[PDB]
Write a protein that binds this DNA or RNA. Structure first.
Ligand code: NA
Ligand code: NA
Ligand SMILES: [Zn+2]
Ligand SMILES: [Zn+2]
Ligand SMILES: [Zn+2]
Ligand SMILES: [Zn+2]
Lengths: 162, 162
DNA sequence: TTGACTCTCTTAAGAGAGTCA
DNA sequence: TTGACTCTCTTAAGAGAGTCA
């Protein structure tokens, strides 16, 4: 299939196209009561999206290039990582939004990690709130906090101990 | 079933039966370098499981009772919460294992909360490591830690800023 | 070769309901 | 009435592949 040089060319064309997406400034919690700023490069809400891009689901897109008469297609956020290993610890690598903004395709807002690691960032206290992720979070996770638990642990009788 | 007395009777029979499950001691990380001990009441691996209980999936069970000559059935971990609201902020309430042990049916190890709150406990630093859950965690989440990220945010050109 | 649609699948925290004996 | 099986569905973080012009 594609040589590593051809893969680099795909990454470069992807960056050139994404770099022309609308750039949206967002103020975000960092943890520790501090606020910061992220600049997201947001794919449009409806077609046309940009050269090579098409929507396969409500918040899913793919990037497609045809090379030597063969059509190649990738998940739209996976392209920055095409020269990296695609699994770790027996788990598939996934594109993980550090900005928690699905439409964003800024490669400086993405990392490449297991789906469990990816999901867990939703609850991280953030880079100024105690983040221990080795590839550090850019912001506090949107779901961090005390939660909204309706009922806690309880028993009616005396059959149980903790 | 319908009446509050009938619901109370269901909860009481469930507690009596689960109270006879084997009690298994598990030592657990609490965060902050500390360890604690939990006593889980574990449903058997194979039939018979206990009066009223049947397995509907590899780690899914249901509890069943006949009331007014009709069968009423519930997810096996939902029974303690039958007098509670079944939603919160428009999200379905779910049984959430504070001990992260699916076979356990100890109601002192369960709470009732949105699926997002439920999931997020997998990454909590724990009651001695910074848990902020209002209904406090019993242990550090099994997935807490630095992660195993294969590649971090990166660009080849100069089109992007954080 | 390209755009704009269509479809189903993965994961791991959770669910509801039917078929037999 | 009770037990022991069978099936598919929900969610929100993520995927692969087909059709037509
Ligand atoms: Na994510
Ligand atoms: Na859980
Ligand atoms: Zn972004
Ligand atoms: Zn983090
Ligand atoms: Zn337990
Ligand atoms: Zn917690």
């Amino acid at each position: 299939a594609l040589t590593n040089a051809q893969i680099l060319a795909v990454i470069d064309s992807w960056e050139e196209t994404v770099g022309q997406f609308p750039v949206i400034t967002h103020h975000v919690p960092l943890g520790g009561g501090l606020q910061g700023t992220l600049h997201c490069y947001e794919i449009p809400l409806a077609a046309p999206y940009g050269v090579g891009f098409a929507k396969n689901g409500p918040t899913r897109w793919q990037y497609k290039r045809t090379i030597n008469q063969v059509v190649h297609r990738w998940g739209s956020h996976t392209v920055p990582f095409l020269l990296e290993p695609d699994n770790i610890n027996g788990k598939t690598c996934t594109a993980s939004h550090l900005c928690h903004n699905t439409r964003c395709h800024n490669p400086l807002h993405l990392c490449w990690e297991s789906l469990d690691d990816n999901k867990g960032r939703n609850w991280c206290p953030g880079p100024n709130g105690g983040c221990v992720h080795a590839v550090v979070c850019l912001r506090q996770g949107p779901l961090y906090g005390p939660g909204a638990t309706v009922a806690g642990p309880q028993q009616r009788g005396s059959h149980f101990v903790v």
